């Protein structure tokens, strides 16, 4: 006879999860036992919850959805930082927490892992704030209807959910899951709006000769990566990707120019959009960083904005549509308008140009490049990508240290890929211990620890003593985690040559991860980050305007 544990386990497996991540605790202990009972759904463990949640973050980038489990408040409050990151990056990460007993609710008791107050709702009062759905199971009869809700909403919205489950309830007997289809099927557009939406879009381009395509960050949540390719071709115009959305459009196809990111756009892409007649943004995320100090933000007269569920065209609005259904019906009536555009030395000290070049050697169609918040953002946005090659940024949320646990998670879902991690010295320190799990699971990850002895990106926004961080022997950390049983390489590289030696050892090494402490100079950095931090620093601290 099924139980709340089984029902949640199965519901996760049905929608996709081969792995759910967890951190033991006396509330979720009984619950965790029953999450094992499903054998198509494996219980991965983690060092702390802040990371555990970020690992489910990554996993959802590869699978499409992820999940985690934690103890009451003490575990979940840290995870909320990842659930914020999920909502930010449109990831259907499903958090789950253990919770007090049923007989303690409103019972005047104080419990452990809580504030000391007699109330325990404060947790999912918080969670609600950062999650599309928030659900407390306190009776096993409720269970299956609410779990379905939490999952169903998360997937429709492409935003995270929350499920707290009283420890003693987790065990109790529950119903059997209904067919999975109950959760997945979605409301589609309305034909009448859809019809008109396309018609007004056609006029936007057919009163012009030089259109452009701009690929937004939210494209992956809409599931429209395919339909953009069939539009870029059927239309033929010059495509460009945004700050995010790197590797959301393939860099083979003839229209792809590069990356548009304001006055720090990769060579030759700022000009095409400025010059052109109108811009077709497909689910963008313009903000103080994406617009680069509010300088590079498309208007409305010469802009079509095709956000996930609501489409603005010059002088008109539409709602109740979908980005995908819009780009399917568009890629048929669209006419073909075009806007055509027209080594280093080894042995010597290692330059940011050298390893950004040499790292581009690794880029296999079976490769996913995880670029951490930092200057590493700008390196990835210069690198040419093969077809099928992926890049993962976390720009909306930007928690440093996200990369490490999210690389661990991404790798559990896609272990046969070549998983490559560009992480700075400072970011790495926040979440380093989750490398020990890459060793535990024996995953072939290639960590490029961009060591520069400081928060270099933060230096070029506004410098100070707060940016100088204690330095580690980042290379030697690997050994400490390998300890008795693991197998994982820990290397260094102070020269352009040493890098090639380390990279060969990395591709060579199996049975675990490979870190490379690529030392470089702080002020040696991309020319974008230089001119970029200025726009952010002044916009950040622009003065109020008196009334
Ligand atoms: C948890 C968290 N704390 C602080 C910040 C602000 N912040 C953004 S980047 C950054 C510095 C990153 O340092 P590092 O990885 O070394 O960047 P690099 O020097 O490689 O460019 C800081 C402190 C943040 N985004 N997240
Ligand atoms: Mg650094």
Author numbering: 2 to 343, 359 to 563
Task: Quote the authors verbatim.
Pyruvate decarboxylase (PDC; EC 4.1.1.1) is a thiamine pyrophosphate- and Mg2+ ion-dependent enzyme that catalyses the non-oxidative decarboxylation of pyruvate to acetaldehyde and carbon dioxide. In this study, we employed ASR to infer an ancestral bacterial PDC designated ANC27. Here, we present the crystal structure of the inferred ancestral PDC ANC27 at 3.5 Å resolution, show that the enzyme is fully functional and compare it with known extant bacterial PDCs.
Overall, the electron-density map was of good quality, apart from the N-terminal methionine and the loop 340–360, which is the exposed linker between the R and PP domains. Each TPP binds as indicated by the domain nomenclature, with the pyrophosphate group binding to the PP domain of one monomer and the pyrimidine ring binding to the PYR domain of a second monomer in a dimer, thus creating the active site in a narrow cleft at the interfaces between the two monomers. The O atoms of the pyrophosphate form hydrogen bonds to the backbone amide groups of Ile473 and Thr472, while the N1 atom on the pyrimidine ring forms a hydrogen bond to Glu50 (from the second monomer). Although the ancestral protein ANC27 did not possess the thermostability that we hoped for, the suggestion that the lack of inter-dimer interactions appears to be the cause of its fragility should guide future ancestral reconstruction protocols to achieve the desired characteristics.
